[PDB]
Design an enzyme around this catalytic site. Sequence first.
Site: not given
Lengths: 296, 296
Positions: B39, B141, B143
Amino acid sequence: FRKMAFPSGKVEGCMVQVTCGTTTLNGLWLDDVVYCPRHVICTSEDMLNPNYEDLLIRKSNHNFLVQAGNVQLRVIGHSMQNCVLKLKVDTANPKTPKYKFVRIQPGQTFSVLACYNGSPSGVYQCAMRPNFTIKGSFLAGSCGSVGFNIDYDCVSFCYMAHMELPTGVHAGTDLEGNFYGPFVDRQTAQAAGTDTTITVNVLAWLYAAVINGDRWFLNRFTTTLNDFNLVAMKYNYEPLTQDHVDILGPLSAQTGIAVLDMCASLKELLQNGMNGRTILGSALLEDEFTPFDVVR
Amino acid sequence: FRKMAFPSGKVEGCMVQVTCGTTTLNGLWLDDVVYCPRHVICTSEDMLNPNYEDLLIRKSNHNFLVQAGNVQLRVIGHSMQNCVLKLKVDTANPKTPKYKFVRIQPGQTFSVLACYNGSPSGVYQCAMRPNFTIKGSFLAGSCGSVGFNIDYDCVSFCYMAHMELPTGVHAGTDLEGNFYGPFVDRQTAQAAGTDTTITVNVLAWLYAAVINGDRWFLNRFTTTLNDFNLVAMKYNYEPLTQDHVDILGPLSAQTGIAVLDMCASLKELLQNGMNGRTILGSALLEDEFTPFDVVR
Ligand SMILES: *C(=O)[C@H](C[C@@H]1CCNC1=O)NC(=O)[C@H](CC1CCCCC1)NC(=O)c1cc2ccccc2[nH]1
């Protein structure tokens, strides 16, 4: 809201094994010095009434075996600072980070890198208890493991483990060899004093709950410092100082809950419990986050 | 008996920053491949119904900016494996450790190195919950942060964080991009199912308590497996299987306490609570130590 340890890589590159006679423990290798507990030079006979300067006098460089993984580091000098042995070695550690030695206060937090015989085993986050002990690693051979904070790639070393106390907690020194708490590096009867909960950290953690939308414990009430400390003493919480109130200032500004408003919440929690509710995830009040930890 | 994370240095040297358009997150640099959540190729208009095959075919190598510290890595190829993007780069990571990819199961444990914009921020030990989520204090942040075990200097990567669920837990994939649980990389109404306690892990930890000299919670009762599961499910405990009983065998033999006898003790602990007492230092029934962890 997990407790997190600091990433340990910068410290892992500094851990070495230090052997003197029959005793092996962990040491910290920064520049061309290895730091470790001075009691490494003690045989069992010495441990009851050590004369450390005389014992070090009778030792030579050849009494110290230092190994950094596969490599043996040749010891070329030895000295003592307080309770820490300083072994000067052949070679500067090429992985020495930016670092400082700092001494912390009870209630402040740091990460411990638990090590066995020079090799890192695990990392955990803890607080310096009010009775000046640290909750144990429960790992044999952990002597010499260090505690630290990291601030913008500078490692602040604040702790080195010297001893396990009978209750499992460990005791130790700063990196300048000054003990935390009334403990000595002699074989004698020593025990952790009665501990208390770190009030300013619980308050910090309630602010974290509020920042994260958990607000059921907020109430209309407020208290005074003196009225709070009367309840604090009753439930064996550290007394709250005006300096504590001030460091919680930024959290009080961010949330709109004055410190004495939140003290009212904490007092009610202590006197009446949680009524089967939880705060963040827990049925228990957490005291190993500092105000600083919560802001960051 | 502290929960510890693995020393994180071997993983820290693999963390990079991956940017595509306006989107930045963490990647894992192993050999000449950077792994990150797919993503990253989503814009704001893409979150609700992303068509990943269409988004990816429109990208070139130069659309991916990979930063390892202060060095830009040149991407020379890209592909998608399930929900993980794989960027082939110019340069094999000189700090690549010995590593494998493994898929874990609910109840198994691992360390998470939490990272922001490619820089490690903290590390913690956790279990994959029965509902396939991770209880993780995961900053904006985070991820692309990864979960791992370290065994004999070999890093087993088992987890990469892809998103936060509304209740504050996170969900993600293995390093082949297959999600844990029924979740998808799409901003939908998807919510963690009701979480349960990991029963086999609590029992393993009660065995660890007995081994370390705690016995206050034992009793003179036993139970059938079926009666235990009927009671335990009333407390939102996972059912215990014959596989779980088999797995507890070594600790049963070590302590001289039959598994169903320990199960009887658990039943009473759920009924009575701890009555102010502690088990291995905690006021809580701990379920994030596996039988493997305890036997070690
Ligand atoms: C250092 O690595 C080891 C770590 C553990 C704990 C004991 N055996 C291990 O492998 N600790 C020690 O070597 C210290 C040496 C101290 C002696 C007394 C004071 C100065 C240093 N020993 C302990 O930490 C210790 C011994 C002991 C005996 C009975 C109850 C508690 C206890 N703690």
